[PDB]
Amino acid sequence: KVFGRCELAAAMKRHGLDNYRGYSLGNWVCAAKFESNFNTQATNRNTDGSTDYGILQINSRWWCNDGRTPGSRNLCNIPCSALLSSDITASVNCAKKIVSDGNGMNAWVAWRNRCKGTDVQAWIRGCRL
Ligand code: NA
């Protein structure tokens, strides 16, 4: 399913992402916009044989198991298909693990390129919660 901006803002907040690892909620909403266009089922194959999955485009190399990323880990202990669910609980859980591994949101290219050092507050502007 495809989220709207404030709809995603609430869903990420609900799931503990406001200010997690010190990333304001807007960073996360921003990230998803440019990672997945807010679509919970976005996948994007990488040349290294991994795939990015879901609203936050979590990668199979380290974070989720999709059973076809050679020599990979599953550090969020989830199948990559959990990250494609309309319910973003697993995606957010996993993203929290990613930013907690010392790479922070630099893990996500679209954050680095379209959110970091920007007015990410704009992505939550006018939202209830
Ligand atoms: Na994996």
Author numbering: 1 to 129
What do the study's own words say?
HEWL is one of the best characterized enzymes. Crystal structures of hen egg-white lysozyme (HEWL) determined under pressures ranging from ambient pressure to 950 MPa are presented. Under high pressure, the crystal structure of the enzyme undergoes several local and global changes accompanied by changes in hydration structure.
The a axis of the new P43 crystal corresponds to the diagonal (a + b) of the original P43212 crystal lattice. Four molecules (A, B, C and D) are included in the asymmetric unit of the new P43 crystal, whereas these four molecules are symmetry mates in the original (low-pressure) P43212 crystal, which has one molecule in the asymmetric unit. In particular, molecules A and C approach each other along the c axis. However, a large deformation of the β-domain is detected only for molecule C at 950 MPa. In molecule A Glu35 takes on dual conformations, as in the 890 MPa structure. In molecules B, C and D, however, the side chains have a single conformation and protrude into the cavity to hydrogen-bond to the newly present water molecules.
